[PDB]
Amino acid sequence: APRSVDWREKGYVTPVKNQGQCGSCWAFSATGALEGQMFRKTGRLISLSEQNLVDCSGPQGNEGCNGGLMDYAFQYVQDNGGLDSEESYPYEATEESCKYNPKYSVANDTGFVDIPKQEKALMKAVATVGPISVAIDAGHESFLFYKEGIYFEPDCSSEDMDHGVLVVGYGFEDNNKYWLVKNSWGEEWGMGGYVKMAKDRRNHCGIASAASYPTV
Ligand SMILES: *C(=N)C1(NC(=O)[C@@H]2C[C@@H](S(=O)(=O)c3ccccc3Cl)CN2C(=O)C2(c3ccc(C(F)(F)F)cc3)CC2)CC1
């Protein structure tokens, strides 16, 4: 693989969004991964509707503003035959009735791939596929108040993840490697809404434990 990758530089990544006070991190992670794959497929970067996922993917197992899984989101898109644009189905940060309109569908998927649970496998996927949906342990104030540099938390769990985000690349700055991770907490958090998570340090915060992407 390349020594560094940043898919933002290749046009795969929309600006940082803000989930607000709704537990919809999973939906932002999923739209991020699908935005990347649709861009690879068509050459068009189109912002996708998290609200559509929040409101409509209950049958697949998601729980709206109370949490959910990226893979369940990808399954919804496949079952549903589409996903609306952000513009057509704007984000409200509350769970509402499903208002999917196929007229404004701009994305689809044909399934998803779960990446082997190792950082070497994750790097290979990031290098070859595009942005990757990932689960992390974000349940430390050190993450809440993260500002800059490589994030390293001695107490982080590699097995108990509670937050879905998007790996958009990787690189290096003694222990100087990182994953470039797009969050969904607005631009004023971290480095323009991004965090450099410690890479190749024993699967820190479980970043390789539940990584996936949609096929398109
Ligand atoms: C996001 N704002 C917030 N977090 C979640 O919804 C996270 C997202 C995933 S994950 O990325 O943490 C994860 C964890 C383990 C295996 C795979 C993945 Cl993708 C799940 N999750 C959770 O907090 C979680 C959970 C919650 C709901 C469900 C559901 F039943 F399907 F709805 C499954 C799992 C405890 C793990 C804070 C809400």
Place of tokens 């709704």: 22
Q: Is 25 exposed, middle or buried (0-12, 13-18, 19+ CB in 10 A)?
A: buried
Measured distance CA(126)–CA(185) in Å, rounded: 22
| Total domains in the fold of the chain | 1
CATH of the domain at 151: 3.90.70.10
204 is catalytic: no
Task: Say if residues 210 and 122 touch (Cβ distance below 8 Å).
Answer: no
d(CA 204, CA 107): 32
Cα of 79 vs centre of ligand 1, distance in Å, is 21
Percent of residues in the chain assigned helix, strand, coil, to nearest 5: 30, 25, 50
Beta strands in 75-182 (DSSP E): 83-84, 105-107, 111-114, 132-136, 150-151, 163-172, 177-182
**Residue 183 known to be catalytic:** yes
Closest CA to 23 of 53, 59, 46, 44: 53
Cα 187 to Cα 17, 135, 147, 191, 195, distances in angstroms: 7, 20, 11, 7, 11
Residues with CB under 6 A from ligand 1: 19, 23-26, 61-63, 67-70, 72, 135, 161-164, 210
90 CA → ligand 1 middle, Å: 22
| Domain region containing 67 | 1-216
Structure tokens belonging to residue 67: 């949490």
Atom of ligand 1 nearest to the CA of 65: 38
The Cα–Cα gap between 95 and 51 comes to 8
Q: Is 65 one of the catalytic residues?
A: no
